[PDB]
């Protein structure tokens, strides 16, 4: 491992693995998986019903005190029965550590709002609802935050087209801005960049 390769830290790896097993032992009702990545990032995969308990634990336990919510977001994977995965990034200042909590939902299953655990979640949840269509139960005021008023659809979904469905212009007959079906003078050029000849043998999937 000469100067072009990123150095690795075994002590942090061991510490994060130990804390992951600790968390899993404490909350076996909700934890389904624990992982530590090769660049020393710990993630915990939980059942959706445990969003409020688990987070509360990680915020209030003396051995965790993850008091900061760094980020809350969603990822859309159409091939899964539960389309959306919800990712919470937490920072602990007492122990100078970071953790990630993942759960899942589909287009019709509500997720509990975590504003009672972290005040920062409020706008984040709004953003998720705006961009993916995930509903959060018991949210103080859930509504659109990024899209235009009356905008239809959720643009961060994979099946949503890049340029959308409508475009805006000014019309002098009705003397106002109007929305019309989108027409592009130059269509966006789709590129097929992926090569054959797989790059990484370590991630090869079984040929099933």
């Amino acid at each position: 491992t000469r100067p072009t390769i990123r150095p690795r830290n075994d002590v942090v790896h061991k510490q994060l693995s130990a804390f992951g097993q600790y968390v899993a032992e404490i909350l076996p009702k909700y934890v389904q998986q624990v992982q530590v990545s090769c660049f020393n990032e710990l993630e915990i995969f939980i059942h959706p019903d445990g969003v409020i308990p688990v987070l509360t634990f990680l915020r209030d336990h003396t051995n965790a005190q993850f008091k900061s919510l760094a980020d809350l977001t969603a990822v859309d994977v159409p091939t899964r029965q539960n389309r959306f995965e919800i990712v919470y990034n937490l920072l602990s200042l007492r122990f100078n550590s970071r953790i990630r909590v993942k759960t899942y939902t589909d287009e019709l299953t509500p997720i509990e709002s975590s504003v009672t655990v972290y005040k920062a979640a409020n706008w984040y949840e709004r953003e998720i609802w705006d961009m993916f269509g995930v509903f959060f139960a018991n949210h103080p005021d859930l509504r659109r935050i990024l899209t235009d008023y009356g905008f239809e659809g959720h643009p961060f979904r994979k099946d949503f087209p890049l340029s959308g469905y409508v475009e805006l212009r000014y019309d002098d007959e009705v003397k106002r801005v109007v929305a019309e079906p989108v027409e592009l003078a130059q269509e966006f050029r789709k590129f097929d960049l992926n090569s054959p000849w797989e790059a990484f043998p370590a991630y090869r999937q079984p040929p099933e």
Binding site: D159, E187, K190
Partner: protein, 125 residues
């Protein structure tokens, strides 16, 4: 605490897609064929969903290529054919599914290149 409803899933009214881009389109679910210019097979592993090709015309200024259908560049990736069928069905798109084409196993023998009495004997190597 559980409704226990029994019905086919349909989220068409919630996706914001215009009416004529639901019941007029035809999606194709298929494993893409290997590019014959190359030998690698890594691009023939996953299932693709792609929409039907619509009109493309020439821009009167600059002669660019113009389109009016918003789904001309939309391609979705799926692990199995069943996942793609489920997605298309719940999204209200009529689909055509093509079965995966697999190269059949072949009998290869270097020794057959130099045959006593068969036609497989090569004239050069």
């Amino acid at each position: 605490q559980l409704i226990a409803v029994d019905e086919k899933l349909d989220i068409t009214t919630l996706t914001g897609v215009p009416e004529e881009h639901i019941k007029t389109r035809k999606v194709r679910i298929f494993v893409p064929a290997r590019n014959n210019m190359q030998s690698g097979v890594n691009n023939t592993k996953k299932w693709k969903m792609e929409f039907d090709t619509r009109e493309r015309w020439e821009n009167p200024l600059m002669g660019w290529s113009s389109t009016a259908d918003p789904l001309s560049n939309l391609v979705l990736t799926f692990s199995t054919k069943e996942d793609a069928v489920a997605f298309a069905e719940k999204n209200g798109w009529s689909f055509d599914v093509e079965e995966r084409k697999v190269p059949k196993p072949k009998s290869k023998s270097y020794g057959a290149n130099f045959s006593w009495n068969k036609r497989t004997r090569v004239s050069t190597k």
